[PDB]
Amino acid sequence: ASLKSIIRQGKQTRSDLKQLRKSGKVPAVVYGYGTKNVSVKVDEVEFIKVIREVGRNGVIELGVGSKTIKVMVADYQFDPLKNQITHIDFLAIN
Amino acid sequence: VSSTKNGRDSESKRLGAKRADGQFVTGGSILYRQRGTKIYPGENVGRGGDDTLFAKIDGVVKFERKGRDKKQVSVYAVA
Amino acid sequence: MLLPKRVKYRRQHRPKTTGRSKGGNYVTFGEFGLQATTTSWITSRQIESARIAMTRYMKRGGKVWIKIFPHTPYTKKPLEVRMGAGKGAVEGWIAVVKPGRILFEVAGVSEEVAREALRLASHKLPVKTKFVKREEL
Amino acid sequence: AKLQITLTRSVIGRPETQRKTVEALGLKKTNSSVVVEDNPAIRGQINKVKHLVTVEEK
RNA sequence: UUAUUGGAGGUAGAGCACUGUUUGGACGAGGGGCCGGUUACCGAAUUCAGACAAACUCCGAAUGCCAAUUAAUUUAACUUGGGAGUCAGAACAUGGGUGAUAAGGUCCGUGUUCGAAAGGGAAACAGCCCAGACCACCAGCUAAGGUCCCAAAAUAUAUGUUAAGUGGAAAAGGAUGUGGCGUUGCCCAGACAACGUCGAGUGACACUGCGCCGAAAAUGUACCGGGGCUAAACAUAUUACCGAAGCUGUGGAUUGUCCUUUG
RNA sequence: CUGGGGCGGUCGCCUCCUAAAAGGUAACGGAGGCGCUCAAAGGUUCCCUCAGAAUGGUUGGAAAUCAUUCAUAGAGUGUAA
RNA sequence: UCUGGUGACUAUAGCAAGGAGGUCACACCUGUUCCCAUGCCGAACACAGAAGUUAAGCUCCUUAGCGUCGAUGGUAGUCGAACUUACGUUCCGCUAGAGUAGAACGUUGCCAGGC
């Protein structure tokens, strides 16, 4: 399991988030052990791919900038209409 | 022939705050009208028979918390 | 049919219909359910009508949950009298559904039978619907 | 430094609170203009009524 | 009026900690099947999960309100006296009650316009959109709205969609109408149908753009204003023009404020 | 007064919701009260702390009374909210 | 530095659990003769003393078990603007409630005694 990420720069307005979601991209955040909070973005279909393979409770090799961080998916918001994930939280696991 | 049994109300009482936080007041100025004590009297502030809060000296008004979930008003002298 | 045993007030203001569904947006008791996609009142005669239609097609095989209850009474005047001499008498009980609210849930049958029974039930309701399954992922 | 403000849209049809701001800015008739020094206060007044005026760095 | 700072207060939204309403499942105490008890069934309590509220609240905004500053712009405010008129309001937008989530209905809150407002647009059309007419002019720039002819200005430049005159009046439902976007099946070792040949694609699902049916009224075509249109329709972008009593240019009138040459 | 008038209902005061987080705000809109009472149920100085739930126990109407623990006003506060 | 008295602070201070301490304090503790007192009970209150005890209250160390506090990111709602009549859409500011990471088994003033 290996997901790659991109760092979101400061202060996305709501139109930016809307365009971002109109792609296959998902806003997310990473926080926890040995790390400071970083706002990132992730592709939706690849995330579904790796989650269908590692399971709901599994470890991911998320790549953030130059680092790579073992991480676990803490929570996620989901739109019941439109059937699409809309936000994910990532938790560094030490 | 139908009618209603509801038709009545009482006149409104003009309760609530009467002076502002940070404003200068004179001796017996009314600061707050209420039923019961939603706000308690603090320093240099009295409480009337109808629970009215009023100043006892000249000074400036200060609303401020009392405990975890209570409030009070005070008046401080120099101004 | 379904109506509360008692209420504090018999004459209430009518609910707000704009917005999106506040809660109950997921299947939690069974495995299939009927999701609403438009907004309306459901009148407690439609609920019984749709439940009878849905429960007889399954031949008393599975279980059914009704995630909706009519809590609000609405009034209506006698036959077309002049306007305004007091509020009218109670006539029915309604529940307000907004897009995203699950309405029924079934379990204990095949996916095919569930699809058919929920389709049968959805034709008795004044709202557009959609067959959904228990979420995962 | 300095700004130049021009009233490009008319004020009739608008709420009165916006008319008071347009008058406080010093603008009077349509297409009339002023020059003012840039402040946070002036910028707040421009922000309130920006669908009516145009600004140039002067 | 704005920036900064301080404060009072329980709406929207959320939530179930209280007061009420409600759906499943447990747990046990009781009556209770029996022959006192099994089990059923019945009611109460505690629990687990999940819902509802104008007269519920452990929470709680955006705004609006009250103030204070040697803050920045601006031009009012108050007091005393003389003279009034008004006390039938209307539509539109938005927060609500009533009514039937009827009315060009009726009653309140908040804005605007009419009333008392000409001019341009909306075919015509007090209340909708743009705009506030001191008087000349056969000068110029723009707003809303527009550029085939009626009738001023693009038969304009790129890309695409529609075949219904949709555009130019409506729903639940129904359907091999056609674009866009993904996920996943069966692929030349031979499917996908026809009856060994057939020699390459063949499905489902999901999601969306535009269209079709559902669609019946009385004097005469008869909601595009008319002609007429396959773009002169509708998404996107570009940039050129037309367009008002708005702004500007030139001359003039009246009054005021400043300086003062009383110009 | 009045969604024409009549018939019916209503007319002063208090509390709540409508009321759009200051105050104010209508309808023959939705719900209730008042036309008193108290010689202590007033003043002051000292003390004190509940309902309820749970487990026991003669009478036990299940609960009257007694004992322990938990128990935020759920008690109580002359009279509506 | 320890203990005590007395203040200030939204429980980050509380409740629960485990473990240790005493003649320097404090408390349990002895008794009811006297001051005083109990709808009865020296239980409580009050007074008189120091025999015992750290058992308890209390003080110190451990734990995040319940309670309390609590971001970032996202979402709801909404001032303003622009389209529109759709149980609406678009842009720009502000920005919850719930939930997650996490904090937390108190901080501090004055006086006396002991150090």
> Could you give the CA distance from residue C128 to residue C37 in angstroms, rounded to a whole number?
5
> Could you give the CA distance from residue C134 to residue C60 in angstroms, rounded to a whole number?
22
Question: What's the number of domains chain A is made of?
Answer: 1
B3 near C CB under 8 A: yes
Coil, helix or strand for C117? helix
Chain C adjacent subunits, 3+ CB pairs under 8 A: A, B
Domains and CATH numbers, chain C: 23-137 (3.90.1170.10)
What does the DSSP assignment read for C35-56? EE-S-EEE-SHHHHHHHHHHHH
Domain residues for D29? Answer: 1-58
- Can you read off the two tokens belonging to residue C56? 């007889």
Shortest distance between the Cα of A85 and any Cα of chain C, in A, equals: 10
∠ CA C94-C52-C104, rounded to 5°? 60
What does the DSSP assignment read for D4-55? EEEE-S--TTS-HHHHHHHHHHT--STT-EEEEE--HHHHHHHHHTTTSEEE
What distance, in Å, lies between the first and last C-alpha atoms of chain B? 68
Please indicate the experimental technique that yielded this structure.
cryo-EM
- Can you read off the two tokens belonging to residue C135? 């979420």
Which letter does DSSP use for residue B50 in this model? T
Residue type, B18: K
Which residues is C102 bridged to in the sheet? C35
Question: What's the number of domains chain D is made of?
Answer: 1
Resolution of this deposited model, Å: 2.5
CATH (domain of A8): 2.40.240.10
Which residues in chain B are contacts of C85 at CB distance < 8 A? 2-4
Domain residues for A87? Answer: 2-92
Q: Is A75 (CB) below 7 Å from strand G?
A: yes
| Å: C16 CA to F20 C1' | 15
Unique residue bearing structure tokens 């101004």: B79
CB atoms within 10 A of CB C88: 14
